[PDB]
């Protein structure tokens, strides 16, 4: 629904994969670097028309597990499920809605995991 951008969908999926390849490698003790990467990605997403996200300063409890799992989910659902050739080669209403809900779950995980 919110993903109809022709050649910018590739950039969106690429950025999602980039985060899911830099932050999960640093899932061993989240620190300021992972937070900075997440903040940059969410500012980029806000610039692309994807809700909005508070900056955030820290972490709390074991919501980092859900955060990392949603990183992986967003990665797999973006590239090779919706954008790349899968069961549906183009991005339709259903695939766009699925990717939007995946991003929403990632945003909720970030908000619940970040101070």
């Amino acid at each position: 629904a919110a993903k109809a951008k022709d050649k910018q969908y590739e950039i969106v999926g690429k950025a999602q994969n980039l985060l899911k390849q830099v932050q999960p490698l640093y899932n061993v003790g989240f620190s300021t670097t992972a937070l900075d990467l997440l903040n940059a990605y969410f500012t980029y997403m806000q610039a692309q028309g994807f809700a909005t996200t508070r900056a955030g300063t820290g972490f709390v409890s074991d919501g980092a597990k859900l955060a990392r799992l949603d990183n992986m989910l967003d990665q797999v659902s973006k590239t090779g499920y919706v954008v790349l050739t899968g069961t549906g080669a183009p991005i339709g209403e259903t695939s766009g809605t699925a990717f939007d809900t995946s991003f929403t779950a990632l945003r909720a995980a970030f908000l619940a995991a970040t101070t």
Binding site: T87, A89, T94
Partner: protein, 108 residues
Amino acid sequence: KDWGDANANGYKERRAVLMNGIPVVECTEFPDAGTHPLGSAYTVTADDAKCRMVTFSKSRTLVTVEAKPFTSRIWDDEQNFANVLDCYAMYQVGERRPDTAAVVKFNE
């Protein structure tokens, strides 16, 4: 032509015809609606049902990823008196290189 050089009968089957150097094979498996068992991704819209002639490469246009091939298995149920027969297969088809496909929509 001469299908048979005796008696009086005309033997024709609706097989392929070489029209423009490309064999126009017939198919009886084009879909109508979205009741495909591999659902939620193979649902056929009203517009998608009017695509009735597709042209593609037979080597580089499609792929069939298989995790469990076709398998017919008979197992005896003991609690219920039954020689129940299962027959299952799990796979997924994807269109590698869609640029090699040429569908033709027909607008009535």
